RNA sequence: UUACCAUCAACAUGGAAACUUGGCU
RNA sequence: UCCAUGUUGAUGGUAA
């Protein structure tokens, strides 16, 4: 899985590596025969000879956890238990540690009692935090950090994946938001949680008939007020007489008084203020630095408390006290290609300056085109075609004087009776501005243009072609678009790779239009990557969907062969759209069908498959590290070792100027094209520059997300599978 | 629907929720 | 009673 193509580069990710040695851990098996409902019964009964059963055990259903071995492996008691007893069977058995699958849950467990060791206490999944806030004295709110943590294994062992967040918070009171709102669904979302006894609690109805003078039988003894309980618990006066009060049941009732309440969250009239939002926005998106402060205090809270590491010692397992540090390695920037001419990118993997004044490849004399649009929208049009003929010859089109063809009005039978009259065999491009963003109206105009009479259209709104001093760009990128939707290329990179065919998709999973499941598939056809062939595969199953994609694939393999009358050496499938709950479906299901039905072309044509899988989402942030300053690292470093499991790798591609960049993951679950995993992450570098939407680098590979856009295209606006006159453009961009 | 990326709320169908002091109302 | 897999509003940034 090694690779040496850049230069080295340290780095750091948020992983605490956990020195933990598991030894002497055996799953032990108490049980008995006469069943017990009670959870807490059988928690007893183990506490009952917890002198011989351990001062330090783990027991959720009989599998009783001891971090030493037993002086008897079988060893048997009868115990009474309080109710009736029942003679319990209390009889140790064992059963090994080795698979180690269980070694990571053991480990969760134990981690989560030591979290809570510390004064943490829980909102949730999350531990968040009550002593350190992160005070805003002008909104009257307050941030409380929090921690979310999950052990997991990795080549160098295994690494805490640790991340924290923000929880929101006030500090008026409920009578004062009361105060204030002179509602239901407002009050009941939120989690209203007491300062005193500080522990979440959920209000689910609220009852404006009860007043702190009713009574409650306190310790199943007399009855007390709400005032005289707080006054004789917490030493606390409450000033309110007939103030409303708060129900909360779990899955008896618990009667919260609204003024030692303190809501959570965000209301809907807190959320809509901007400069609220704008000010828990600088706290919420941390820059590396922030983030890795919050880590290292972490870290040192771990360390210092004196309980939590006591019960680290009686596991067995040692921390360590810096988060983890390696020598990743950036690729050289990519020599961006035009008409003769070259640029390297910068720093940031960004030319979209070079772009707006250097020559495309491959330009389409776009001669006969229309525009359409109402009568309001005739000046913004007219602008915008004068902006396009002024921005083309400086990039190498050459545009000519378009049709210009009014509707009746703005419904959208006018529309498509416009568009049914215009549509002819010279007509190239249709422009169609909408007056708003009205989705059925679009979803009926693509229909037109993409299934009955497929001609590649450009439909844009009223707005973006109305506020100068941006009109200029405005017209830049639809025009670089334009030239995309008509089989031009715009820009290139040097691919080393000779015959290596690409294919990438990506599932549009959606309950919106009967569970369909659409599929998209993109593939390849010249040397240099710089035009596609786009299929579509919509089926309600899960087997003869693969079927169609079978079919998709032996039409773009004909495809390539007459493109470039030969056929490829290899083939590489960029896969996108597999989370974690469904990563095997394609190792063993979908890649042997891509495998079987090669024959047919040629004499043993077996192409050497690759399959890649890629996931845009993970817990894992990487920063550079620049003496002891934290950066995000620029684009183009790779991470191949020490937080990868099985041949795979992350790639930092993206640049973002606010907070921390997220890396991309990318698997190879089957490998089969013989490239050296140096040049298949190279190649997938490279392809990152290769989407002409956006001039510079993005989070996946280009096929991904043209496959993407195809299958949301198809699934959402058009419901149907497009012509076949359109495969050999990008008419999806 | 000119594009790409960082946060964050509601509506759909994947798990789950024990410790611990026992103890919130 | 909460977090995941998501499908969608309203916020931020960029673009000579
Ligand atoms: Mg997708
Ligand atoms: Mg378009």
């Not at 050496?569 to 063993?588: N, P, Q, T």
Request: net charge positive; hydrophobic share 35%; proline share 5%.
């Amino acid at each position: 899985q090694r690779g040496s193509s850049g230069q080295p580069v340290p780095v750091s990710a948020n992983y605490l590596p956990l020195k933990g040695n598991m030894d002497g851990v055996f799953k032990y098996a108490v049980g008995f025969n006469p069943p017990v409902e009670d959870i807490r019964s059988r928690s007893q009964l183990l506490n009952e000879h917890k002198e011989l059963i351990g001062l330090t055990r783990v027991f959720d259903g009989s599998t009783l956890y001891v971090p030493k071995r037993i002086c008897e492996q079988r060893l048997d008691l009868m115990s009474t238990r309080q109710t009736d007893g029942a003679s319990i069977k209390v009889t140790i058995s064992l059963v090994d540690s080795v698979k180690n699958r269980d070694v990571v849950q053991l480990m969760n467990v134990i981690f989560k009692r030591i979290l809570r060791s510390l004064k943490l206490q829980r909102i949730g999944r999350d531990y968040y935090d009550a002593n350190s806030p992160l005070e805003v004295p002008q909104h009257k709110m307050q941030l409380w950090p929090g921690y979310v943590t999950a052990i997991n294994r990795h080549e160098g062992g295994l690494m805490l994946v640790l991340d924290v967040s923000h929880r929101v918070m006030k500090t008026d009171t409920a009578l004062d938001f009361l105060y204030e709102l002179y509602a239901f669904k407002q009050l009941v979302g939120s989690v209203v949680l007491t300062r005193y006894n500080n522990r979440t609690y959920e209000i689910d109805d609220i009852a404006w008939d009860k007043n702190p003078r009713c009574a409650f039988q306190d310790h199943a003894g007399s009855q007390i007020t709400f005032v005289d309980y707080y006054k004789r618990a917490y030493d606390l006066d409450i000033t309110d007489l007939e103030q409303p009060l708060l129900i909360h049941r779990p899955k008896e009732m618990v009667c919260l008084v609204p003024e030692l309440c303190a809501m959570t969250g965000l209301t809907d009239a807190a959320r809509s203020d901007f400069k609220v939002m704008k000010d828990l926005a600088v706290h919420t998106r941390v820059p590396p630095e922030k983030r890795a402060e919050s880590f290292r205090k972490f870290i040192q809270r771990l360390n210092t408390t004196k309980e939590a590491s006591e019960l680290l010692h009686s596991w067995g397992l040692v921390l360590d006290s810096r988060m983890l540090d390696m020598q990743g390695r950036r690729l050289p920037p990519e020599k961006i290609l035009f008409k003769h001419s070259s640029i390297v990118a910068n720093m940031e993997a960004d030319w979209s300056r070079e772009c707006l004044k250097e020559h495309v490849i491959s330009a389409v004399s776009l001669l006969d085109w229309a525009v359409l649009f109402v009568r309001k929208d005739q000046g913004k049009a007219t602008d915008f075609v004068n902006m396009l003929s002024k921005v083309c010859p400086p990039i190498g089109m050459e545009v000519h004087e378009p049709k210009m063809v009014e509707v009746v009005n703005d419904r959208t039978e006018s529309y498509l009776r416009a568009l049914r009259e215009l549509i002819a065999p010279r007509l190239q491009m249709v422009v169609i501005v909408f007056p708003t963003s009205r989705d059925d109206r679009y979803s009926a105009v693509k229909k037109l243009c993409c299934i009955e009479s497929p001609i590649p259209s450009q439909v844009l709104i009223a707005r973006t072609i109305t506020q100068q001093q941006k009109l200029r760009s405005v017209a830049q990128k639809v025009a670089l678009q334009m030239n995309a939707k008509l089989g031009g290329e715009l820009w290139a990179v040097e691919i080393p790779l000779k015959s290596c065919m690409v294919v990438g998709i990506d599932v549009y999973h959606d309950k919106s239009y009967g569970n369909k499941s659409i599929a998209g598939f993109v593939a390849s056809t010249n040397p240099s990557f710089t035009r596609w062939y786009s299929r579509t595969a919509m089926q309600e199953q899960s087997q003869e969907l693969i079927h169609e994609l079978k079919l998709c694939m032996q039409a773009a393999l004909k495809k390539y062969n007459e493109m470039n009358q030969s056929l490829p050496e290899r083939i590489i499938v960029f896969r996108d759209g597999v989370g974690e709950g469904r990563e095997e479906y394609v190792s063993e299901f979908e890649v042997p069908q891509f495998n079987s039905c090669f024959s047919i072309f040629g004499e043993n044509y077996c192409p050497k498959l690759a399959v890649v899988v890629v996931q845009k989402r993970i817990t894992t942030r990487i920063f550079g590290r620049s003496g002891h300053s934290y950066d995000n690292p620029p684009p183009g470093v790779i991470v191949d070792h020490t937080i990868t499991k099985s041949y795979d790798f992350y790639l930092v591609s993206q640049h973002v100027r606010q907070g921390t960049v997220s890396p991309t993951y990318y698997r190879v679950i089957y490998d089969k094209s013989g490239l050296k995993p140096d040049h298949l992450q190279r190649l997938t570098y490279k392809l990152t520059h290769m989407y002409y939407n956006w001039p510079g680098t993005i989070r996946t590979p280009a096929p991904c997300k043209y496959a993407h856009k195809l299958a949301f295209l198809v699934g959402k606006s058009l419901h149907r599978d497009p012509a076949h006159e359109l495969s050999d453009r990008l008419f999806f961009l």
